[PDB]
Design an enzyme around this catalytic site. Structure first.
Site, PDB file in Angstrom:
ATOM      1  N   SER B 198     -40.267  46.568 -11.553  1.00 38.11           N
ATOM      2  CA  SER B 198     -39.465  46.364 -10.401  1.00 38.11           C
ATOM      3  C   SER B 198     -38.822  45.257 -10.054  1.00 38.11           C
ATOM      4  O   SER B 198     -38.136  44.825 -11.386  1.00 38.11           O
ATOM      5  CB  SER B 198     -40.297  46.594  -9.013  1.00 38.11           C
ATOM      6  OG  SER B 198     -39.662  46.463  -7.733  1.00 38.11           O
ATOM      7  N   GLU B 325     -38.237  57.841  -8.887  1.00 34.36           N
ATOM      8  CA  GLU B 325     -37.765  56.546  -8.243  1.00 34.36           C
ATOM      9  C   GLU B 325     -37.419  56.386  -6.978  1.00 34.36           C
ATOM     10  O   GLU B 325     -38.318  55.633  -6.220  1.00 34.36           O
ATOM     11  CB  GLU B 325     -36.860  55.648  -9.420  1.00 34.36           C
ATOM     12  CG  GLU B 325     -37.570  55.472 -10.769  1.00 34.36           C
ATOM     13  CD  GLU B 325     -38.412  54.340 -10.863  1.00 34.36           C
ATOM     14  OE1 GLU B 325     -39.001  54.070 -10.287  1.00 34.36           O
ATOM     15  OE2 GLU B 325     -38.220  53.910 -12.140  1.00 34.36           O
ATOM     16  N   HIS B 438     -42.434  55.252  -7.391  1.00 28.53           N
ATOM     17  CA  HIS B 438     -41.946  54.146  -7.931  1.00 28.53           C
ATOM     18  C   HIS B 438     -43.233  52.966  -7.935  1.00 28.53           C
ATOM     19  O   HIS B 438     -43.767  52.970  -6.878  1.00 28.53           O
ATOM     20  CB  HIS B 438     -40.778  53.583  -7.048  1.00 28.53           C
ATOM     21  CG  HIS B 438     -40.485  52.217  -7.480  1.00 28.53           C
ATOM     22  ND1 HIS B 438     -39.785  51.942  -8.816  1.00 28.53           N
ATOM     23  CD2 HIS B 438     -40.513  50.931  -6.778  1.00 28.53           C
ATOM     24  CE1 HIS B 438     -39.356  50.510  -8.905  1.00 28.53           C
ATOM     25  NE2 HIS B 438     -39.948  50.147  -7.637  1.00 28.53           N
TER      26      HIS B 438
HETATM   27  C1  LIG Z   1     -44.083  51.043  -3.921  1.00 33.45           C
HETATM   28  C2  LIG Z   1     -44.388  50.274  -5.085  1.00 33.45           C
HETATM   29  C3  LIG Z   1     -45.048  48.782  -5.031  1.00 33.45           C
HETATM   30  N1  LIG Z   1     -44.222  47.670  -5.625  1.00 33.45           N
HETATM   31  C4  LIG Z   1     -43.785  47.827  -6.977  1.00 33.45           C
HETATM   32  C5  LIG Z   1     -45.151  46.625  -5.387  1.00 33.45           C
HETATM   33  C6  LIG Z   1     -43.094  47.592  -4.603  1.00 33.45           C
HETATM   34  C7  LIG Z   1     -41.874  48.077  -4.983  1.00 33.45           C
HETATM   35  C8  LIG Z   1     -40.673  47.681  -4.155  1.00 33.45           C
HETATM   36  C9  LIG Z   1     -40.886  47.216  -3.024  1.00 33.45           C
HETATM   37  C10 LIG Z   1     -39.659  47.330  -2.018  1.00 33.45           C
HETATM   38  C11 LIG Z   1     -39.473  48.325  -1.065  1.00 33.45           C
HETATM   39  C12 LIG Z   1     -38.391  48.333   0.153  1.00 33.45           C
HETATM   40  O1  LIG Z   1     -37.748  47.020  -0.020  1.00 33.45           O
HETATM   41  C13 LIG Z   1     -37.892  49.569   0.607  1.00 33.45           C
HETATM   42  C14 LIG Z   1     -38.536  50.029   1.691  1.00 33.45           C
HETATM   43  C15 LIG Z   1     -38.397  48.954   3.172  1.00 33.45           C
HETATM   44  C16 LIG Z   1     -37.155  49.460   3.605  1.00 33.45           C
HETATM   45  C17 LIG Z   1     -37.148  48.950   4.708  1.00 33.45           C
HETATM   46  C18 LIG Z   1     -37.823  47.977   5.633  1.00 33.45           C
HETATM   47  N2  LIG Z   1     -37.645  47.145   6.934  1.00 33.45           N
HETATM   48  C19 LIG Z   1     -36.098  47.583   7.204  1.00 33.45           C
HETATM   49  C20 LIG Z   1     -37.607  45.919   6.879  1.00 33.45           C
HETATM   50  C21 LIG Z   1     -38.561  47.958   7.856  1.00 33.45           C
HETATM   51  C22 LIG Z   1     -38.384  49.460   7.980  1.00 33.45           C
HETATM   52  C23 LIG Z   1     -39.407  49.942   8.201  1.00 33.45           C
HETATM   53  C24 LIG Z   1     -38.971  47.470   4.949  1.00 33.45           C
HETATM   54  C25 LIG Z   1     -39.401  48.190   3.593  1.00 33.45           C
HETATM   55  C26 LIG Z   1     -42.164  47.162  -2.240  1.00 33.45           C
HETATM   56  C27 LIG Z   1     -43.336  47.153  -3.342  1.00 33.45           C
END
Ligand SMILES: C=CC[N+](C)(C)c1ccc(CCC(=O)CCc2ccc([N+](C)(C)CC=C)cc2)cc1
Ligand SMILES: C=CC[N+](C)(C)c1ccc(CCC(=O)CCc2ccc([N+](C)(C)CC=C)cc2)cc1
Ligand SMILES: *[C@@H]1O[C@H](CO)[C@@H](O)[C@H](O)[C@H]1NC(C)=O
Ligand SMILES: *[C@@H]1O[C@H](CO)[C@@H](O)[C@H](O)[C@H]1NC(C)=O
Ligand SMILES: *[C@@H]1O[C@H](CO)[C@@H](O)[C@H](O)[C@H]1NC(C)=O
Ligand SMILES: *[C@@H]1O[C@H](CO)[C@@H](O)[C@H](O)[C@H]1NC(C)=O
Ligand SMILES: *[C@H]1O[C@H](CO)[C@@H](O)[C@H](O)[C@H]1NC(C)=O
Ligand SMILES: *[C@H]1O[C@H](CO)[C@@H](O)[C@H](O)[C@H]1NC(C)=O
Lengths: 533, 533
Positions: B198, B325, B438
């Site tokens: 990632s 993904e 992902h």
């Molecule tokens: C899953 C794989 C694990 N690993 C690879 C470590 C991993 C890979 C990628 C990410 C980023 C996830 C996000 O950025 C989208 C989800 C997201 C969208 C919006 C929000 N808010 C707007 C802040 C709050 C809404 C609820 C927060 C998260 C994390 C962990």
């Protein structure tokens, strides 16, 4: 005989009886419906035919209108079956009628409007012989003639000496005479169906659209052709350009709009025919020089509006399309296609091909088109590039425009039946890579599979009768289906489900949304993209 | 023991022995590689770690860097396995090393760079536990830490107090220390492979690209992430906007670039974290606020040029992508997706969905995108709209950008191996509509299927070892394949044929041109269309 003598409001007409299969029907050939457009009538609207005296010998075929003759494959049946088979002449405004025997009381009338890019045509071709249909279905068949090429479509908008759509009028006039006299041949005027293919199909739809034609017929059938095809009309402006550009090649005096016409009026017909194709404004496959003009007289507004507001005759229609439409045009105009060859296309001729097909498109547009029909998992396949090109030409010029016409129409229409023909005649003389070719469902509609000597299979003769009935039953019912018959029904096309059917030797199947993904691209996306540019 | 005492150029380090399966290996946890970025070091480049005296207790885990904590599904394992599991702190610049036992002479070193949108991360998560890989493959595994969020990416270009890419440096510095000391833990400095997933995978590729990093490692592995991803960088300009916009929310004095920094420097870390997401410039799924900036110092030019001229480290790389993904991002950000639900999407949320995904696209662009992923033969299918949306997010943000990076790379690179992971763990706790998610190939790479208690199937434990070997063999060979092994070979990726392979429980198959049709759209058509507009 008396059977062979008829009295029309125009004059008396003596026909001839002709053999058909096992029986004998009567036929009236070459009855004039307008004063010959020769002399300085050239380019002008048709004039009604001043009644004659005595009897007219409607026993022989009429002359064919002046036109370009396809000499591409001299002697090849495949190509010459469409070439004029009678002495060409500017005096060619006649019509033909195949009447059952005994003469009916008053029965369904079917008018055939031939077509060929608006530059060629002919009511006398053997593929358009009424007797089989007239006889097999007990129907009064009439095929008409009309002025093609510059002779019928040269348009200098302001002038009364040469307004366009003139050849579209020859049609109306024939349509007028039929309405006013077909009752004397035992045809029912309240029930005439006009059906045409290619440019003829587009003409049919242009009469459904036009106010002055609207009242003269009952129902319609369009075969491989809607009136809004990209190749079927032009602005009065473009029409004028090509008008003068023609004069320019013939060393005319482009000074005065009156003089231009005079000059063009003094040239031997064939001289006009020689430079006819030098007026197109771009290198391209599937575009013709003289075509109907959106003038404001024959057409109140742009076709799109009319289609859009329901400004058209609302009756019921039956239309269709063939499996390989683009095939024929590529062969004749794209680089890489050959008749005696397999015709696999290089990824380099495929590019050339695409450009010729969407001549009004810019780069981005062309890419869109390619991104669309190209297979990228294997993007240099000879066959894939060949067949993919056939779909581009077909979709863009025939299928997608018709589908558009069909949707906007059935939203007000009183019935819509749609077929998808895809049977390849066992004896086609054209090469296989061409498949179910453009204009090759005609021989089935007119019942040729019914004559032994043409070596058609048995299930083919079966399919011809199947077609011929659908076509005739529709013509006098407004529905193809037999009131009760124990067969599968040809479902009506709805904007909901939109079913259509397969026309071929095996048992009918009905399908849905014909080429919808490909047509949304043509009918919506591409246009919006070239618009934003 | 002596095994547990090591002397690095920085100081002496006392580790701990930890059980692993049947045996016992040694581990050194939380060795510092830089002076803590606390105080007014906040936002500044990392500073080398002044050698300490006496022994350092590398027996316990380090603190985790400040960051946004996912509280979306409190208690849900699926979600919390990624949340920080140690006390967060601004003092979080440490690294961990899993060393075999007995200590090797000098063996292959593998550096893990975690990642999570550049706003979250953590070297201490149980899914990133080196012992299984270190032990099963006889390898020195080291995972590093780096500053995420505003703490590591806030970029006020001109200022020396807050230039961007700072967290990218914490990386280089860890990379520096490893190069300068890993030889004392029996690791071979001439053979270290850095692999990340990632945002970590993108970081890995940004070091292949960057001059100052280039020399510090041997080979690379990128998992679900290339450096040119649409979400992985921004102009120094956009970086500056978001810098001040952050100040604006925190009632900072946006007057002087020096003062802005001072203000931001006095706020409790968590206060910055609270407004962190309010700086994005558009409603969208898969974009993060503080990210690497193309400054001209870390990156000489735009990534595209570098990629284009071969201005990058040419070694051999092994990269890959997962089957579903986009799945994870939709669930968290698109309307209509729910965890405890089937999540069929209305043709109306699908539109909303698409907009969020291609936030920089105008109408025409959006249509293009839709025309592309919509099935028109059945355009209102709950599942089709759901799955079709998963492909849009995935292709656009992970797959297609990587494929681009892969093509431009292998044109100069010294070897390219490409996998397509698509096995769905038997025990995944997430719903099925999510598929091969992902970041879920990570647990396989780090060998968790090897511990009974986690209830993984038997063929899954088989696949984990299969992966773990490919990964380690590559790391010290520059080829995944066993010199002679009687197995099928993981073919090299060529710009000719471009083969890649399937990673899953059944026998490997090799395929060609991964998502080529869809990627030409993203990598070429769409861009050219939004460009002409
Ligand atoms: C899953 C794989 C694990 N690993 C690879 C470590 C991993 C890979 C990628 C990410 C980023 C996830 C996000 O950025 C989208 C989800 C997201 C969208 C919006 C929000 N808010 C707007 C802040 C709050 C809404 C609820 C927060 C998260 C994390 C962990
Ligand atoms: C086949 C179906 C039969 N029916 C339906 C009657 C029929 C339908 C349609 C047409 C028009 C055919 C063409 O306009 C394309 C082929 C063409 C292209 C270029 C040229 N030149 C440039 C003038 C000469 C090049 C060689 C001539 C023809 C004819 C007959
Ligand atoms: C066709 O028209 C008739 C008479 O106006 C009407 O009863 C019928 O519902 C119409 N059907 C269609 C196809 O709309
Ligand atoms: C078979 O049918 C064709 C097609 O009309 C005809 O021309 C031919 O004469 C028939 N038999 C022969 C001589 O091949
Ligand atoms: C990789 O590099 C070596 C040494 O420079 C060279 O011999 C080999 O041909 C290269 N192979 C590739 C994958 O280009
Ligand atoms: C089965 O494996 C899961 C996944 O780690 C574990 O949490 C669980 O305790 C095991 N058995 C049970 C209690 O369902
Ligand atoms: C008149 O028509 C033609 C003349 O060309 C010919 O068949 C014949 O002389 C006449 N027709 C008949 C059969 O009376
Ligand atoms: C030093 O590290 C920690 C202190 O938090 C603890 O495990 C122990 O007191 C020391 N480590 C060992 C095992 O010597």
């Amino acid at each position: 005989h008396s059977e062979l003598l008829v009295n029309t409001k125009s004059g008396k007409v003596m026909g001839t009886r002709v053999p058909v299969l096992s029986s004998h029907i009567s036929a009236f050939l070459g009855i004039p419906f307008a004063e010959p457009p020769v002399g300085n009538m050239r380019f002008r609207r048709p004039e009604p035919k001043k009644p004659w005296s005595g009897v007219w010998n409607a026993s022989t075929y009429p002359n064919n209108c002046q036109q370009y003759v396809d000499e591409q494959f001299p002697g090849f049946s495949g190509s010459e079956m469409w070439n004029p088979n009678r002495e060409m002449s500017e005096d060619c405004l006649y019509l033909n009628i195949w009447v059952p025997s005994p003469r009916p009381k008053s029965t369904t009338v079917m008018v055939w409007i031939y077509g060929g890019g608006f530059y060629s045509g002919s009511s006398t071709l053997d593929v358009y012989n009424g007797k089989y249909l007239a006889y097999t279905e007990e129907v009064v068949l009439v095929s008409l003639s009309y002025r093609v090429g510059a002779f019928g479509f040269l348009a200098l908008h302001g002038s009364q000496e040469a307004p366009g759509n003139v050849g579209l009028l020859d049609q109306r006039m024939a349509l007028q005479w039929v309405h006013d006299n077909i009752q004397f041949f035992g045809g029912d005027p309240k029930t005439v169906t006009i059906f045409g293919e290619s440019a003829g199909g587009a003409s049919v739809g242009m009469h459904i659209l036009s106010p002055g034609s609207r009242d003269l017929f009952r129902r319609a059938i369009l075969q491989s052709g809607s009136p809004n095809c990209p190749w079927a009309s032009v602005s009065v402006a473009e029409g004028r350009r090509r008008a003068v550009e023609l004069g320019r090649n013939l060393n005319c005096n482009l000074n005065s709009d009156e003089e231009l016409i005079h000059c063009l009026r003094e040239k031997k017909p064939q001289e006009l025919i020689d430079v006819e194709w030098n007026v197109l404004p771009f290198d391209s496959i599937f575009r013709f020089s003289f075509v109907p003009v959106i003038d404001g007289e024959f057409f109140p507004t742009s076709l799109e509006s009319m289609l859009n507001s329901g400004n058209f005759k609302k009756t019921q229609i039956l239309l269709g399309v063939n499996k390989d439409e683009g095939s024929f045009f590529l062969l004749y105009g794209a680089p890489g296609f050959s008749k005696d060859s397999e015709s696999k296309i290089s990824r380099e001729d495929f590019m050339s091909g695409v450009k010729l097909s969407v001549p009004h498109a810019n780069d981005l547009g062309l890419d869109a088109v390619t991104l669309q029909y190209t297979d990228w998992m294997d993007d240099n396949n000879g066959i894939k590039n060949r067949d993919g090109l056939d779909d581009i030409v077909g979709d863009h010029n025939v299928i997608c425009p018709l589908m558009h016409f069909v949707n906007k129409y059935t939203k007000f229409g009183n019935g819509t039946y749609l077929y998808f023909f895809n049977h390849r005649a066992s004896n086609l003389v054209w090469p296989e890579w061409m498949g179910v070719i453009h204009g090759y469902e005609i021989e089935f509609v007119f019942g040729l599979p019914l004559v032994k000597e043409l070596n058609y299979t048995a299930e083919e003769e079966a399919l011809s009768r199947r077609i011929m009935h659908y076509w005739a039953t529709f013509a006098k019912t407004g529905n193809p289906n037999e009131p009760h018959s124990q067969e599968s029904k040809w479902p009506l096309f709805t904007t909901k489900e939109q079913k259509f059917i397969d026309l071929n030797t095996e048992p009918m199947k009905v399908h849905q949304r014909l080429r919808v993904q490909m047509c949304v691209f043509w009918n919506q996306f591409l246009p919006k993209l070239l618009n934003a540019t």
